[PDB]
Amino acid sequence: QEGNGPAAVHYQPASPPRDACVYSSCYSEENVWKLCEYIKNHDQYPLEECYAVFISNERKMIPIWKQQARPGDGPVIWDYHVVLLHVSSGGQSFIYDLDTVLPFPCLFDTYVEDAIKSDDDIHPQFRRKFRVICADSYLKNFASDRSHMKDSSGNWREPPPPYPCIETGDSKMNLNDFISMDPKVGWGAVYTLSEFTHRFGS
Amino acid sequence: QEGNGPAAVHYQPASPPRDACVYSSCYSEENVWKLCEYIKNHDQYPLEECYAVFISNERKMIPIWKQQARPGDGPVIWDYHVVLLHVSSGGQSFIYDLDTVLPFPCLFDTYVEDAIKSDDDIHPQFRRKFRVICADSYLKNFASDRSHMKDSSGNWREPPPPYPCIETGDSKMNLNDFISMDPKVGWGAVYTLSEFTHRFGS
């Protein structure tokens, strides 16, 4: 028998701690994009091991439990919500959600169970779908002019993030193409809750 | 009526107290063999209720927390480690580890939870595997010439136990066959951490 030298044996998060991440309430698509930017700019993990994940449905009403906005367990009904998925080297997958009360990051199995619960127990208009976009692709292609966050009067529904709107060489606004769950549109692949769970679950 | 709560269920230990057990640091395989020999030579419990348990992995680096060699400070990373498992007629199972800072013996659910933790977020190279050998079989078959404990110059890595090497009619050395977590090799059965915990846990 011999005791080896000390070593870090646990998964190391790809992000900064939850309280050190760039964040604006109601701009999860951006918060997630910012995590992608951080990962890209660091050498800990390849960017391609990560995915931006949009959650929505045709009716744009998805319940998510264990959300910060509503502490104590009823759900928040969102039009869409975005989280980050890290498909880690050992078959262990993690979810980074800046709006969850669950750990940041959180093991995938735990997150999907606690946050989402079962689609079977809710009516069809509320069922959850997921667009999974590889992080490199997301940085390359995502663009939002934040126009959706201004009311009829031109005032901000929620204050915007402190940096200029994300744009690309090809577009200044394509957020709807990410929110959409039609496989004929946008980038990445679309999965039902069951499919998503099976695909990235343990 | 008598009610307790798992940690409070009554149990009489199969060994002498920790301070009276034969023990050499870095020779857990031998320390456990000696415990098996003691049990055999006593009439308290049938030997067949007990198992020698080897803990290792392919890379031979396994973390174990609550270890004497590293008080309060993370895990010890062992090439391999050996403990005794008593499957009690009392319905609760116990772990005897001469190297733990937990009680000796310790209720199984508690030992695994504190000492082992989960492999859910542990790097692949560090995941724990268990070889469980019924105690009668261990005494019948185990042999070690202690050759692994001599360095390249022929000197001891750690001082040996002060009794002659354990040998059998069939071998002078088969320690590698116990350390191995290959089911094709050796005696007993091999389990993942999850399997081991589900099997012997509550």
Side-chain angles (χ1 to χ4, degrees):
Chain A
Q1 257 195 309
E2 187 155 310
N4 216 333
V9 303
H10 290 114
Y11 167 79
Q12 305 293 316
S15 68
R18 173 202 294 277
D19 71 23
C21 304
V22 168
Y23 172 89
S24 290
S25 169
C26 295
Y27 297 84
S28 68
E29 67 288 343
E30 301 202 21
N31 300 336
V32 175
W33 188 100
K34 287 276 154 175
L35 287 180
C36 284
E37 181 182 50
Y38 175 90
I39 292 160
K40 183 189 171 172
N41 290 328
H42 289 75
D43 290 339
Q44 190 181 8
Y45 302 112
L47 186 58
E48 301 81 12
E49 294 185 357
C50 300
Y51 298 83
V53 180
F54 277 66
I55 315 161
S56 201
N57 62 19
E58 202 211 293
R59 304 272 274 275
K60 293 169 61 187
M61 46 196 332
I62 47 142
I64 306 189
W65 287 260
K66 305 292 222 205
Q67 286 277 293
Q68 286 178 2
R70 318 240 336 153
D73 234 21
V76 167
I77 314 296
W78 290 109
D79 44 349
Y80 69 93
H81 189 53
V82 195
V83 309
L84 189 96
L85 169 66
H86 187 199
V87 177
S88 217
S89 89
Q92 46 204 41
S93 301
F94 294 87
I95 288 286
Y96 295 70
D97 182 358
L98 287 165
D99 284 303
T100 193
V101 298
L102 293 170
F104 181 91
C106 188
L107 273 157
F108 180 94
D109 292 340
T110 305
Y111 187 89
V112 308
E113 303 163 352
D114 300 358
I116 289 132
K117 302 178 166 204
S118 183
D119 259 2
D120 290 337
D121 294 349
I122 317 279
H123 290 99
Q125 65 263 29
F126 296 121
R127 273 149 200 176
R128 277 69 50 99
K129 283 174 180 189
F130 303 83
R131 182 183 287 278
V132 178
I133 314 101
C134 204
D136 51 316
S137 176
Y138 191 56
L139 295 179
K140 178 178 163 61
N141 297 127
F142 182 76
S144 174
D145 68 4
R146 298 171 188 156
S147 58
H148 68 299
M149 294 296 283
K150 284 252 185 88
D151 55 23
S152 49
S153 313
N155 308 100
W156 291 103
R157 304 180 190 281
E158 308 276 348
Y163 50 80
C165 295
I166 297 155
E167 45 176 272
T168 79
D170 312 314
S171 167
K172 292 180 183 210
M173 179 58 149
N174 60 15
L175 175 58
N176 281 346
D177 295 345
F178 292 85
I179 299 178
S180 170
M181 297 294 142
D182 182 355
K184 291 194 307 313
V185 335
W187 292 272
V190 177
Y191 301 96
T192 58
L193 172 57
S194 164
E195 291 171 334
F196 179 77
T197 294
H198 290 139
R199 182 161 176 87
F200 306 105
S202 83
Chain B
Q1 260 195 309
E2 180 171 285
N4 289 286
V9 179
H10 182 250
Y11 171 67
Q12 191 82 12
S15 59
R18 184 202 289 269
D19 302 339
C21 295
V22 171
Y23 167 87
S24 296
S25 164
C26 296
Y27 296 79
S28 59
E29 65 288 342
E30 296 200 29
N31 305 335
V32 170
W33 189 97
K34 288 274 163 174
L35 241 197
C36 291
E37 176 181 56
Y38 177 89
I39 288 167
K40 188 223 220 292
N41 290 339
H42 285 76
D43 267 309
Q44 193 182 352
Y45 298 114
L47 187 58
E48 299 75 20
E49 300 191 347
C50 307
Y51 300 78
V53 179
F54 278 66
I55 316 135
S56 192
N57 66 18
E58 190 168 25
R59 295 275 303 271
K60 288 167 50 175
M61 38 193 206
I62 52 128
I64 299 182
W65 287 262
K66 303 290 205 173
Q67 282 282 290
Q68 299 220 318
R70 181 163 169 184
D73 198 24
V76 165
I77 309 293
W78 286 115
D79 49 350
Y80 72 88
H81 191 49
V82 194
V83 305
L84 185 94
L85 158 74
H86 185 210
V87 175
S88 191
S89 74
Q92 291 207 131
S93 303
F94 292 80
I95 296 291
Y96 295 70
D97 184 358
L98 287 165
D99 283 300
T100 196
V101 298
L102 301 169
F104 181 88
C106 190
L107 183 73
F108 181 99
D109 282 349
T110 304
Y111 187 90
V112 314
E113 200 183 348
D114 299 354
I116 282 138
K117 301 192 174 180
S118 164
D119 266 347
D120 279 355
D121 74 333
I122 296 281
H123 300 148
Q125 67 262 35
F126 289 125
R127 304 202 277 239
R128 279 61 62 83
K129 293 188 157 152
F130 303 71
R131 186 182 280 277
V132 175
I133 313 98
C134 211
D136 52 314
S137 183
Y138 193 53
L139 297 178
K140 169 169 154 230
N141 298 121
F142 182 77
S144 176
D145 72 0
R146 299 172 186 147
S147 42
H148 67 297
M149 298 290 288
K150 301 300 213 88
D151 61 25
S152 54
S153 88
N155 290 287
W156 294 109
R157 296 175 195 285
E158 296 286 355
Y163 53 80
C165 290
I166 293 152
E167 56 179 73
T168 75
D170 301 316
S171 177
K172 311 291 224 249
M173 182 54 160
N174 60 18
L175 178 54
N176 280 346
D177 297 337
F178 291 83
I179 297 175
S180 171
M181 295 293 138
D182 184 348
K184 299 202 304 305
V185 168
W187 291 271
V190 175
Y191 301 100
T192 56
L193 172 57
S194 164
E195 297 170 325
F196 180 74
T197 70
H198 297 344
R199 187 164 177 85
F200 301 106
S202 278

